């Protein structure tokens, strides 16, 4: 439209209306030129490939991509508190995306000083893959997401994908994708880009904790009409066999018949927060629960949704069972325990097994006058008819959606790291700097990106008489206030915030 | 109405779906001891990234498995015993044991070994195409913790021979 | 309605989670109902 006319405004607010929420986030980005405008084969061989489990083959691309997939991109800590305290459920509905105020730059370096200037004739190529033809990397929980604080300017992550590998070498079935081979819009300093996306129907994420446990659903005042076997012997002695049947009732609640059982489990090793309780050996990798695929072992992370610990044992956590985030300014490798935030999965204890406990016991033999009854422990249990379970909670720092892998079959597609599983997730958005040949002119672009999401709410009609548990800021003097910048201007998220506060009946 | 039969092979594997160029924002437990010697205990955490791709958090896991005995087309590699029936995976129904054939859809063999085949899992047609999402028929599905570790007791694992459906599993059916 | 633009979360009236003999704002074993503490109306914040 014009060089001196802005192609968009800064829209950054949340609107609460009835049963829905509309969040709008605008950020400022910068796009470097990656790989010097080249597609480059990459493999563990370039990385050194010490192990076959880490072996990979793929391509790095000159393109970047936009990732808003985290909850913090669209919700302020106050908005998140408003939502998790007042609502039993929520879910995304519509998606509106805008890319505007493009500013391409040319970098020229003479001696020790680099001079930056405007290039008014350069373009920026942006396109979305709405047929899902490219590999989808947005469900892998990567960095490069829009910053939680709106005043932060962020760098766009480089796009890359992996295809079939044999060691570091490829195979005849491996695929190569030229992102230039897609149609794409080209933007100069006056052009803008926008599209709208409709979330496909998903179930509301359950932002609540059950007030009942799966095994306590009974009326405590009344007997069952069912009987259970109370006594197999009359007393101590030879040939004391007998059959005695008590009725199941309030006094013995463990023996009663139940219609439903807790969900599946794949046991995790538990690690105590207080280290001297831990074994004096290296078990991070050797003691981990894993799954093997085509000869490659993969840690089970986070795994099926299970309780992090039993009641009264706050210190313990599943080895790879829970989500572990970083604190602001945390190093990359071998950080101390204080540096990270290990999420708690306690709210799901009412219906799900503890991650570090056996699911139960099964009989391993036939008893007889010769042989005693023998029971083994169930370390892993698949789905059984009559199971009910809770999905993993979503967090303010956590992912929103994932792509359901395209397959002949799946069960309960809800992603294991939490959030909303989708066959057609929000499409990847690819961007690169169109090369200007000089060998090229060193160049980068700067821009404004805005994303708007409509959320549907599920209110509580609950009749609970006593007050709830709510997320609240602590009222005490402190050097800083939570979820705010410090004296040096560094925004930080001091804690992960779960979504489960309000309660429901089971 | 039936679903379309899949007549394609995935060009990706379930564990490689990540962006190879970018770290995750999630941490894993890297190191449980500082150094050799007594009373060394510590919890160190690292970012999951391109260099170590086995420990990254993933949203989906491979489908269920019921292990088949591995049999080689080279007669001298196989055991010198009659294990056709005795070493075969079977299921029992009302006292009658039925061989598991072909069974759940699983990769026939690992990449690099074409001489081995599942004892009763093969129609000898090859099911190597579905390995991307499916466990190998002759391999354990994975490992699980068998105990609570402690200062006295080391962390103990165990092999999963059969795994039923779990939420988050994806799989391919058998080819036509 | 509260239409605050405050970035950081508010202070909210909450029930504490800890194991205890009785439930606050509930009846005891004898059926007596009791209100454990006086609850004020002022939690959310405004500018002056």
């Amino acid at each position, epitope marked *: 439209d014009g060089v001196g006319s802005s192609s968009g405004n800064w829209h950054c607010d949340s609107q609460w209306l009835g049963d829905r929420v509309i969040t709008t986030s605008t950020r400022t980005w910068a796009l470097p030129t990656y790989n010097n405008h080249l597609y480059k084969q990459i493999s563990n061989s370039t990385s050194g490939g010490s192990s076959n489990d880490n072996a990979y083959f793929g391509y790095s691309t000159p393109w970047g991509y936009f990732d808003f997939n985290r909850f913090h991109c669209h919700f302020s800590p106050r908005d998140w508190q408003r939502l998790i305290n007042n609502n039993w459920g929520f879910r995304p509905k519509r998606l509106n995306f805008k890319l505007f105020n493009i500013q391409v730059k040319e970098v020229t370096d003479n001696n020790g000083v680099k001079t930056i200037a405007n290039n008014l004739t350069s373009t920026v190529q942006v396109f979305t893959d709405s047929d899902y033809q490219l590999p989808y990397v947005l469900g892998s929980a990567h960095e490069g997401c829009l910053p939680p604080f709106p005043a932060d300017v962020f760098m766009i992550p480089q796009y890359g994908y992996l295809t079939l590998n044999d060691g570091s070498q490829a195979v005849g079935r491996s695929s190569f994708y030229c992102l230039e081979y897609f149609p794409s819009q080209m933007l100069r300093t006056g052009n803008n880009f926008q599209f709208s996306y409709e979330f496909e129907n998903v179930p509301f994420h359950s932002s609540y904790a059950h007030s009942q446990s799966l095994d306590r659903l009974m009326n405590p005042l009344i007997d069952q009409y069912l009987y259970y076997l109370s006594k197999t012997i009359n007393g101590s002695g030879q040939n004391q066999q007998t059959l005695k049947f008590s009725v199941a009732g309030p006094s013995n609640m463990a023996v009663q018949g139940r219609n439903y059982i807790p969900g599946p489990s794949y046991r995790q090793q538990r690690v105590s*927060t*207080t*280290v*001297t309780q831990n074994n004096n050996s290296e078990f991070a990798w050797p003691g981990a629960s894993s799954w093997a695929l085509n000869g490659r072992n993969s840690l089970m992370n986070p795994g099926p949704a299970m309780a*992090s*610990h039993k*009641e*009264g*044992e*706050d*210190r*313990f*956590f599943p080895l790879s069972g*829970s989500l572990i985030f970083g604190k602001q300014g945390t190093g990359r490798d071998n950080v*101390d*325990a*204080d540096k990270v*935030m*290990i*999420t*708690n999965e*306690e709210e799901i204890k009412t219906t799900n097994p503890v991650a570090t406990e056996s699911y139960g016991q099964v009989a391993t033999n036939h008893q007889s006058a010769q042989a005693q009854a023998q029971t083994g422990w169930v370390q892993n249990q698949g789905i059984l008819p009559g199971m009910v379970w809770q999905d993993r909670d979503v967090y303010l720092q956590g992912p929103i959606w994932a792509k359901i892998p395209h397959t002949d079959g799946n069960f309960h597609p809800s992603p294991l790291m939490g959030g909303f599983g989708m066959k057609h997730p929000p499409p990847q958005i690819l961007i690169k700097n169109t090369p200007v040949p000089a060998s090229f002119i060193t160049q980068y672009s700067t821009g404004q990106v805005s994303v708007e999401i409509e959320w549907e709410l599920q209110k509580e009609n609950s009749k609970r008489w006593n007050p709830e548990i709510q997320y609240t800021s*602590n009222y*005490y*003097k*402190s*050097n800083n206030v939570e979820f705010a910048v410090n004296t040096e201007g560094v925004y930080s998220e001091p*804690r*992960p*915030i*779960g979504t489960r506060y309000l309660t429901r009946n089971l | 109405n039936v679903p379309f039969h899949s007549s394609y092979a995935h060009s990706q594997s379930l564990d490689r779906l990540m962006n190879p160029l970018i770290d995750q924002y999630l941490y894993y437990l890297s190191k449980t001891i*500082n150094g050799s010697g007594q*009373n*060394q*205990q*510590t919890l160190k955490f690292s970012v999951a990234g391109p260099s170590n791709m086995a420990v990254q958090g993933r949203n989906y896991i491979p489908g269920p498995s019921y292990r088949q005995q591995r049999v080689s087309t080279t007669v001298t590699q196989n055991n010198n015993s009659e294990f056709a029936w005795p070493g075969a995976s079977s299921w029992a129904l009302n006292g009658r044991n039925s061989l598991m054939n072909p069974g759940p859809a699983m990769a026939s063999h690992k990449e690099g070994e074409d001489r081995f085949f599942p004892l009763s899992g093969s129609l000898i047609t090859n099911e190597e195409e579905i390995k991307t999402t499916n466990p190998v028929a002759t391999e354990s599905y994975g490992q699980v913790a068998t105990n609570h570790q402690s200062a006295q007791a080391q962390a103990q694992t165990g092999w999963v021979q059969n795994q039923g459906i779990l939420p988050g599993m994806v799989w391919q059916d058998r080819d036509v | 309605k509260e239409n605050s633009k405050r970035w950081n979360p508010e202070i909210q009236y909450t029930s*504490n*989670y*800890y*194991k*205890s*003999n*009785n439930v606050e704002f509930a009846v005891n074993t004898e059926g007596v109902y009791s209100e454990p503490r006086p609850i004020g109306t002022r939690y959310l914040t405004r500018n002056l």
Partner: antibody
Amino acid sequence: VQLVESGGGLVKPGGSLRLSCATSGFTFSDYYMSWIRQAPGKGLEWVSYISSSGSTIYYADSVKGRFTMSRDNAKNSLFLRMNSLRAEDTAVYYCARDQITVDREVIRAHYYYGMDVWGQGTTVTVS
Amino acid sequence: DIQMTQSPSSVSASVGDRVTITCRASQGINSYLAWYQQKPGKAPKLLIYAASSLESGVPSRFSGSGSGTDFTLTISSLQPEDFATYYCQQANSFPLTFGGGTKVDI
């Protein structure tokens, strides 16, 4: 924030004594509490440590098996019950609380940053 | 268990002087070290936690450093209020242990 110890007394060896700590100014359930004693003319010595819930309790080897630490959340107070009191149990006993407040969402050790708030303490003499 | 050592046992200084107190652990305690100052007839006060972090209210002059086995407490431009006994405790693992203590002497 304030911690007030009471119940200190002079008792003969083998006697049973109960100490209390009344707390005000902070939410009692958000912190882990610990008893610490100081023998006269000597450095401070850690005694016991209790979880916010009260489910988990730790003790010093010397006091183990004779001292019981309890917690009443409804009426804020911290209790130490001392049985089989012996000669060198004479100390000034301090009620202290961890600097790191308990956060339900995360699993962590709360004693890493030490104990920010200490009570005046109660003298206990055994003879 | 982990033992703590403070050298010197006691130190004498004038107002405005710079005082350094050093304590080291028998085994590495990461950065989990706390410094306490105690005055006769009064409960201990926490000045420094997690090796280099200064507790609120505590004066700017007080400082601390070190990691692993060795830690150090530094007082610069010492004041009248500053004369007391100082204890360093390792908060790495149970049982919590304290150093013998250093008594700053007028």
